[PDB]
Amino acid sequence: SLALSLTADQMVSALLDAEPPILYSEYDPTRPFSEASMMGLLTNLADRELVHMINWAKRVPGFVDLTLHDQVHLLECAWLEILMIGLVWRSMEHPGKLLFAPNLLLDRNQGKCVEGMVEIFDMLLATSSRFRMMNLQGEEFVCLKSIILLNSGVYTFLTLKSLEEKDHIHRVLDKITDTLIHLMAKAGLTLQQQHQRLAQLLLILSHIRHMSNKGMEHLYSMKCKPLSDLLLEMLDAHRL
Amino acid sequence: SLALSLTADQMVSALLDAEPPILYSEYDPTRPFSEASMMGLLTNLADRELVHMINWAKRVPGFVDLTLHDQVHLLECAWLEILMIGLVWRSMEHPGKLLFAPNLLLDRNQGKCVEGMVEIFDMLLATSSRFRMMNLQGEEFVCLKSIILLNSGVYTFEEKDHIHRVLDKITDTLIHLMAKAGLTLQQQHQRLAQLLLILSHIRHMSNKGMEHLYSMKCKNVVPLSDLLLEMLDAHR
Amino acid sequence: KILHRLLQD
Amino acid sequence: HKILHRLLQD
Ligand SMILES: Cc1cc(O)ccc1-c1ccc(-c2ccc(O)cc2C)s1
Ligand SMILES: Cc1cc(O)ccc1-c1ccc(-c2ccc(O)cc2C)s1
Structure with a gap:
């Protein structure tokens, strides 16, 4: 099934090549901003990244093999998590700041x-x-990031010939774990160090879920009282 | 900290011994279920389990080493997750049902x-x-269950480093268990990943549950113990 | 849904 | 203080 035959080095390669671009904000000398204004940049940004996330997802090995309904469910569950880990990743070397865009570097x-x-x-x-x-x-x-896409929604599927889907997603998930371990062995970590690091990485995913949960709560709070049609749809999926 | 001095086997033995009992529900089979009465049984049950949880937590290696303020935070963050994993654990042999208590075994x-x-x-x-x-x-x-307790609140904070080395010790223990069970080395790292990724979904369930609880508490559906009120408040 | 459309094309 | 704090403090 193509994705299962991939080697560890090829998985990495596939993923690195699938990476979306880093979009800029439409922030300008308009300085400064109000509640409304800052909110606009964030959502416009996220809205525009969503298009690129969808095409990135299609290139995550194993994703295409799933039904359109299941692909939809995965992205619906994962989109804000995926955006958030993206954000924290490009904010790594900017202690105390969140790099939403190269031209939008916010402190707390x-x-x-x-x-x-x-x-x-x-x-x-x-x-x-x-x-x-x-x-x-x-x-x-x-x-x-791929793990998030595949994992965050897999338990909200279900009987019938849907177990075939779940099993496929888990085989791919194992592949990615193999790939993480591979990257760690390559980096020279001992066996004990590998497992430990794997664990550390995955536990952070729980915190990322938590942030998306809260964020999704706030985002919904704010749309009740101008988000794109896409965003609104992605948001409605978390409110039955 | 003797937590770090523990071996995998000592780790497992300590945790097995610290296990809380399976409590019973105030379930009364003479009256039909209402939203209020079901929520009553559930929250009564959770309330009694909480006391056992607080005491179990103090028995989780390393936990005692933290400030009262940090112990409060971790429990405040993890309490529902922890009730949920326990529930899911004891319901394993009951496909299609949830064993909230031996006398409270429900279907959807x-x-x-x-x-x-x-x-x-x-x-x-x-x-x-x-x-x-x-x-x-x-x-x-x-x-x-112990990972959830130590992990779920650690990012919403030294002490933080102390927690991580305890967590690492629990990773070693999980792997040790898996080796002992005769899983291959690859199977070990794969199982470890599978188990921990489920924690993300337990986090998810907790947060969605918390939001329903707050909604109901704000609609006065059921009298909540003061303990539950404060745990519930902790999540704003 | 829009997501459907983006996933298809 | 918090009931949780007391329960732990005990
Ligand atoms: C989640 C949230 C909650 C609020 O109360 C207010 C704003 C937001 C956000 C909207 C868009 C966000 C965003 C945007 C771009 C991005 O690359 C990553 C993220 C995460 S955050
Ligand atoms: C969280 C929740 C949300 C609802 O909409 C309805 C009920 C609940 C629950 C209340 C208590 C629950 C509970 C109680 C005891 C236990 O050992 C495990 C759990 C999980 S669940």
Whole structure:
């Protein structure tokens, strides 16, 4: 099934090559910004990244092999998680700042403008600091990001010939674990160090789920009281 | 810290011994279920389990080494996750059902009266079936429960470094268990990844559950113990 | 849904 | 303080 035959080095290669581009914000000398304004940049940004995420997902080995319904469910569950780990990744070398775009580099005080954002901000920063302290490697990040796509929604599927899908997603997931271990052995880590590092990486995914949960809550809070049609749809999936 | 001095076997033995008992529900089979009465049984049950949890937590190696303020944070963050993994664990041998208590064993239909309960129920059943398909062992479960306790709040903070080395010690223990079970080395790292990725879904379930709980608490559906109120408040 | 469309094309 | 704090403090 193509993805299962891939080698560890080919998986990395496939993932690195699948990477989306880094979009810029439409922030300008308009300085400064209000609650509305800052919110606009974030959502416009996320909206535009969503298009690229979808085409990136199609290139995640094993994703195409799934039904259109299952692909949809995966992205619906994962999109904000995927955006967030992206953000924290490119914010790694910017302690105390969140790099939404090369031209949009926010510190936590700017996050105060916009309610409840602070707390989400702090969590993203702490995650970024954690990645920094672990010296997260780029090849590890693409594995983690793919893992999120495949994992975050797999348990909200289901009977019938759907178990065939779940099993396929888990075979691919194992492949990616093999790939992470491979990257670690290559890096020279001992066996004990590999397992430990694997564990450390995956536990951070729980925190990333938590941030998406909260963020999704706030995003919904704010749309009740201008988000793109796509965003709104991606958001409705988390509210039955 | 003697936590770090523990061997894999000492780690497992400590955790197995610290296990809380299976408690019973105030279930009364003379009255029909209402949203309020079901929520009553559930929250009464959770409340009593919490006391046992607080005492179990103090027995998780390393936990005692933290400040009271940090112990409070971790429990505040993980309490529902921890109740949920326990529930999912004891429901393994009951396909299609959730054993909240030996006298409170429900299927998805019995929760329809309750706001959001069927949604969470379905998620819990899925996790239970997954643990069942993977053949989760008791020794692995207690490792998982302790990881949740130590991990779920550590990012919302030295002490943080102390927690990580305890967690590493639990990773060594999980692998040790898997070797002892005769899994290949590749199977070990694959199983480790599978188990930990399920924690992301337990996190998910906790957060969705928390939100339904807060909704109901704000609609006065059921009187909540002051303990539960404060744990519930902790999540804003 | 829009997502359907983007996934198809 | 918090009931949780007392319960732990005990
Ligand atoms: C989640 C959220 C909650 C709020 O209360 C306010 C704003 C947001 C956000 C909207 C878009 C965000 C965003 C944007 C771009 C990106 O590359 C990654 C992220 C994560 S965050
Ligand atoms: C969280 C929740 C949401 C709803 O919509 C309806 C009910 C609940 C629950 C209340 C108590 C629950 C519970 C209780 C005891 C236990 O050992 C494990 C759990 C999980 S679940």
